[PDB]
Amino acid sequence: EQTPLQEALNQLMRQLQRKDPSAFFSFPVTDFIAPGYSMIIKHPMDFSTMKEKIKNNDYQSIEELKDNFKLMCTNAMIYNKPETIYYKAAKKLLHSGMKILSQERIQSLKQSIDFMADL
Numbered sequence: 001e002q003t004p005l006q007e008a009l010n011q012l013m014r015q016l017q018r019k020d021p022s023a024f025f026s027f028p029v030t031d032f033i034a035p036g037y038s039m040i041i042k043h044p045m046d047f048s049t050m051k052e053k054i055k056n057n058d059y060q061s062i063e064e065l066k067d068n069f070k071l072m073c074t075n076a077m078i079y080n081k082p083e084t085i086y087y088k089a090a091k092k093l094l095h096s097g098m099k100i101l102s103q104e105r106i107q108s109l110k111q112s113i114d115f116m117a118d119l
């Protein structure tokens with residue numbers, strides 16, 4: 001049993017994950033695979049945590065999910081240097097994600113979500 005907001009967040013989530021076919025951003029970055037990551041990135045974020053926040057109804061607006069998505073890409077652009085494949089994939093993912101999470105699309109969903117309340 002999910003609210004219209006939760007289901008809209010999951011559809012956007014699945015569309016965002018299709019822009020990351022390499023699964024670079026599907027799971028948290030550990031210190032084991034990236035030394036000093038916990039000491040450099042103060043607010044780590046990844047697709048798995050965002051999906052967990054959706055299922056626990058932690059997200060309030062699509063904008064909050066969009067803020068986490070921006071944080072996810074910018075984190076990779078701080079820890080990784082501009083030549084790295086992680087930096088370049090994060091830059092491309094962020095740009096694609098901003099078109100998906102555009103104010104135009106966030107709006108069509110806000111109306112449909114609202115129309116599913118108050119009968």
Ligand SMILES: COc1cc(-c2cn(C)c(=O)c3cnccc23)cc(OC)c1CN(C)C
Nearest residue numbers: 022023024025027028029033034076080086
């Ligand atoms: C959690 O798992 C993975 C994380 C990364 C990964 C991501 N980001 C954003 C980074 O900045 C990063 C920085 N240094 C080293 C690694 C990463 C890469 C993976 O493989 C290439 C896997 C493993 N498979 C799921 C694909």
